[PDB]
Design a protein around this nucleic acid. Structure first.
Lengths: 38, 141, 563, 131
RNA sequence: AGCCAGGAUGUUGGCUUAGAAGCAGCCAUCAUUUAAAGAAAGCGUAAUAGCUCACUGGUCGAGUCGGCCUGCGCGGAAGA
């Protein structure tokens, strides 16, 4: 998981969820697009 | 079992019967062999194309044979061997992009309307006209 | 083998052999227990279950009763074996049709005949590590595999081929007629030649005429083997494998016999290697001490070819995989104590003009102060398309002005021959090249062709470089036959390399795919090919054309010498 | 855009072609082959006429509000997609013949010979006309 | 919003003429066939496969979709 401080929707199927105060990106296509903190 | 679902689009032109030699080997598995290497093309394509633009067949039958609903000559080879000019893509901006006439389009219908049809023989005429014309340009006749 | 391991099954393996390879396997055994419940083997002829003993004590058998957990399936494959054996001949079918089972002896003989005629394959199970099933496999070895004479009689041939020129068979009276099938490297006595005596009797020191290699040989000793230990024995007879010592001329596949000539045995076939690299010892002084071991190894092994190179001074070798060359390089370091550090084979670039002819001259004379006489010729640099003249050099004469001396015109072509072989681009032989000549200067005295040749040298080296030939790189015609699982994958690798491709045709058991690849890239291509398709691909690499490609590796020789 | 005003336009524009001629059809969205579908709507044109308009702008209520100023029961677009095909030449013309031939042969659905009707009399085809 | 499905046989494109593939480089080229042909979207894109840029009629009945400014927040934010 990337831990970049500026997470975006890098692809089509990368969505933005807000688990536990932190904004996480859960990508359903390429697990390279899992980025951690908003 | 169906129409051409062996769509490995690669072959020689209609000069030498679907020569793999000019097809190239990026084609995975399909079954071209000595059963139908020269089966129907060299028999009933002599009025279609011999050494000009030719999209190739990938058709196979339903009873261990090779048969399909065959069609007539390719339009981009009829309205281009009757037009002289071999343009189209490649130089479509500053030069003449191929000779496409109205009688050329009606003749392209008359030549490639055997089983290659559309909403009518006139719709297939619009088809072969888009063929001759959307190569990039046309001739003034 | 290896039933003892996790997920191991028997009927699935039987189905595998039945379906994939195309044969017909019949169970001669059924296994009691799959992974660790494996405790022994139940049979379908004896119809009794064997439970071997504990670790490394599996010598015993302890014949025991078939457990009821497997009685039904044992009965099913028993009857299936019964009918499949009765399938051998008619008198075994009707007797069974009468409501009576055949007996062990005739089932065994009938199946054994099936194996002789190569119709069937029998399967036995076991676990060579837990020491179970080995003896019961030996049981099958005895009961079903042909003995030397049970096999059809060997097809011997005279110096000419017929249906039965030399009907040979295993006999103490038959002529000594055998096949030297294996050589081995022995440092002590030089070589060590295995041979399987098809027919006859031969003794120590006795004569033998090498029917193929056209010489007579002798047997300094005849040693049968215990996997390494050479047992000294007096003589060897038919059906008895042995290793001959000292016979010099023979290599693999040759046929050794008496003077009565069953000279031609059928085979002279061996595969072609696919990997190639070059080698070099601790220093270039030991090169003969390296080529010597290489010669021994190439006389021992057929597929491994020591390949002295003419273009460069390297010694390249060819094998059938990364592992085979690896044993060879260590075996070379180990048995022949000269270590060779390895690299890639050098490339084979080339030179030729595109299409254009260019007019050029080169002038210099000699005798202004009374010296010897000169030469001078005008030339124009026309190429032909790659592959136009099969002879790499074609000439047309046009001398009309300053006509060079009557015995000097052919030497002008033969001197531009030197410039062709020289290849003023990077030293490489210019190919398909042509030169046309027009002018010059002469008298009716003794001029020097060498001056015309140097003159032609300056002319060649300028006019070629300014007519802009092409610096080509070796491109090979490739053929690869691989199953339909990784056609796309192997083609992908090829295109990532330099993929120029030929076509596609579906064989019975795969796909026919040919292509065009650079020899600068195909070096280690074999291991990668097999790794991309589990090693189910067949392929050979051969030359089709030379061609150019944008590459900054094109200056190595230019760096070593030349422009 | 499938708008309400443009739909009030297109519904009447599709109802006029059946208010001047004869019966039409539809075709659902369940199964269509490449060559079959292309050349088959092609042959629809070549047999019935250039009056083949596979348009689906007859929403199960939009048609019932725009076309149904007469024959108000036109909410039979509660079936699947609509590939319309009217015909000018006679009552239930070669277009309706294509409908009947494609309802069950070499196809998925051709509107199950629902057709249309200006007369809409008792349930019987028109074949009591010997010649 | 969820449930029913349809993208060539002119077009290995007239094509960097062995295509670079019915949707690689490369040019453009709806090409009527439209609940549709882009000479294309993720998988074969150097190949077909079954899912399919796109698009829609069916389904189903009250809200619905993106923006712009903005109050207040959140992550950024790790020491003895």
């Amino acid at each position: 998981m990337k831990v970049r401080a500026s997470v975006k929707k890098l692809c089509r199927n990368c969505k933005i969820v807000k688990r536990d105060g932190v904004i996480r990106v859960i990508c359903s296509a390429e697990p390279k697009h899992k980025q951690r903190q908003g | 079992a169906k129409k051409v679902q062996a769509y490995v689009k690669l072959q020689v032109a209609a000069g030498m019967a679907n020569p793999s030699p000019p097809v190239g080997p990026a084609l995975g598995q399909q079954g071209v062999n000595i059963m139908e290497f020269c089966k129907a093309f060299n028999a009933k394509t002599d009025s279609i194309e011999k050494g000009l633009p030719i999209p190739v067949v990938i058709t196979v039958y339903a009873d261990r044979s090779f048969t399909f609903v065959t069609k007539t000559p390719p339009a981009a080879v009829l309205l281009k061997k009757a037009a002289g000019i071999k343009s189209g893509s490649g130089k479509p901006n500053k030069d003449k992009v191929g000779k496409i006439s109205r009688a050329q389009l009606q003749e392209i219908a008359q030549t490639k309307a055997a089983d290659m049809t559309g909403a009518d023989i006139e719709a297939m005429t619009r088809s072969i006209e888009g063929t001759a014309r959307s190569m990039g340009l046309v001739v003034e006749d | 083998n290896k039933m003892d391991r996790m997920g191991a099954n028997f009927l699935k393996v039987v189905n595998q052999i039945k379906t994939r390879l195309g044969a017909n396997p019949v169970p001669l055994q059924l296994a009691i227990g799959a992974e660790e419940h494996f405790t022994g083997v139940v049979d379908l002829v004896k119809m009794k279950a064997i439970n071997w003993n504990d670790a490394d004590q599996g010598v015993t058998f302890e014949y025991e009763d078939i457990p009821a957990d497997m009685v039904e399936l044992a009965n099913e494959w028993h009857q299936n074996l019964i009918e499949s054996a009765a399938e051998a001949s008619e008198e075994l079918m009707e007797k069974y049709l009468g409501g009576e089972e055949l007996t062990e002896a005739e089932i065994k003989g009938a199946l054994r005949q099936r194996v002789l005629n190569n119709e069937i394959i029998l399967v036995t199970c076991g676990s060579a590590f837990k020491n179970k099933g080995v003896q019961a496999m030996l049981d099958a070895v005895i009961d079903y595999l042909p003995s030397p004479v049970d096999v059809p009689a060997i097809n011997g041939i005279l110096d000419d081929g017929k249906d039965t020129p030399a009907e040979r068979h295993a006999s103490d009276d038959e002529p000594f007629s055998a096949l030297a099938f294996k050589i081995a490297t022995d440092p002590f006595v030089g070589n060590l030649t295995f041979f399987r005596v098809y027919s006859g009797v031969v003794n120590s020191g006795d004569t033998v005429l090498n029917s193929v290699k056209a010489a007579r040989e002798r047997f300094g000793r005849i040693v049968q083997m215990h996997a390494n230990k050479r047992e000294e024995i007096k003589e060897v007879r038919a059906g008895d494998i042995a290793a001959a010592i000292g016979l010099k001329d023979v290599t693999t596949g040759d046929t050794l016999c008496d003077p009565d000539a069953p000279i031609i045995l059928e085979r002279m076939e061996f595969p072609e290697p696919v990997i190639s690299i070059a080698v070099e010892p601790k220093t270039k002084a030991d090169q003969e001490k390296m080529g010597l071991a290489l010669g021994r190894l190439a006389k021992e092994d057929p597929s491994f070819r020591v390949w002295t190179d003419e273009e460069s001074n390297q010694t390249i070798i060819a094998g059938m995989g990364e592992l085979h060359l690896d044993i060879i390089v260590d075996r070379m370091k180990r048995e022949f104590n000269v270590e060779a550090n390895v690299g890639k084979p050098q490339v084979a670039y080339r030179e030729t003009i595109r299409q254009k002819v260019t007019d050029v001259e080169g002038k210099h004379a000699k005798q202004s102060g009374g010296r010897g006489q000169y030469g001078h010729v005008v030339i124009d640099m026309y190429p032909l398309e790659p592959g136009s003249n099969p002879k790499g050099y074609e000439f047309i004469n046009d001398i009309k002005g300053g006509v060079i001396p009557g015995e000097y015109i052919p030497a002008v072509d033969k001197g531009i021959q030197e410039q062709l072989k020289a290849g003023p681009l990077a030293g490489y032989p210019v190919v398909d090249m042509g030169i046309r000549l027009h002018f010059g200067s002469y008298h009716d005295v003794d001029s020097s062709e060498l001056a015309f040749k140097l003159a032609a040298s300056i002319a060649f080296k300028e006019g070629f470089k300014k007519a802009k030939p092409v610096l080509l790189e070796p491109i090979m015609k490739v053929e690869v036959e691989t199953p339909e699982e990784n056609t796309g994958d192997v083609i992908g690798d090829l295109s990532r390399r330099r993929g120029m491709l030929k076509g596609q045709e579906s064989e019975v058991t795969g796909v026919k795919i040919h292509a065009e690849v650079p020899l600068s890239e195909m070096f280690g291509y074999a291991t990668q090919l097999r790794s991309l398709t589990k090693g189910r691909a067949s392929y050979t690499m051969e030359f089709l054309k030379y061609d150019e490609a944008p590459s900054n590796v094109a200056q190595a020789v230019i760096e070593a010498r030349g422009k | 855009m499938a708008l309400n005003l443009q739909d009030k336009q297109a519904i009447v524009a599709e109802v006029s072609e059946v208010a001047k001629g004869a019966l039409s059809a539809v075709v659902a969205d369940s199964r269509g082959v490449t060559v079959d579908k292309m050349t088959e709507l092609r042959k629809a044109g070549r047999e019935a006429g250039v009056y083949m308009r596979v348009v689906r702008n007859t929403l199960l209520r939009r048609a019932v509000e725009g076309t149904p100023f007469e024959c108000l029961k036109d909410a039979f677009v509660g079936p699947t997609l609509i590939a319309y095909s009217m015909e000018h030449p006679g009552a239930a013309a070669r277009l309706f013949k294509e409908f009947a031939k494609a309802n069950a042969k070499f196809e998925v659905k051709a509107a199950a010979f629902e057709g249309e009707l200006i007369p809409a009399s008792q349930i019987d085809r028109l074949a009591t006309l010997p010649t």
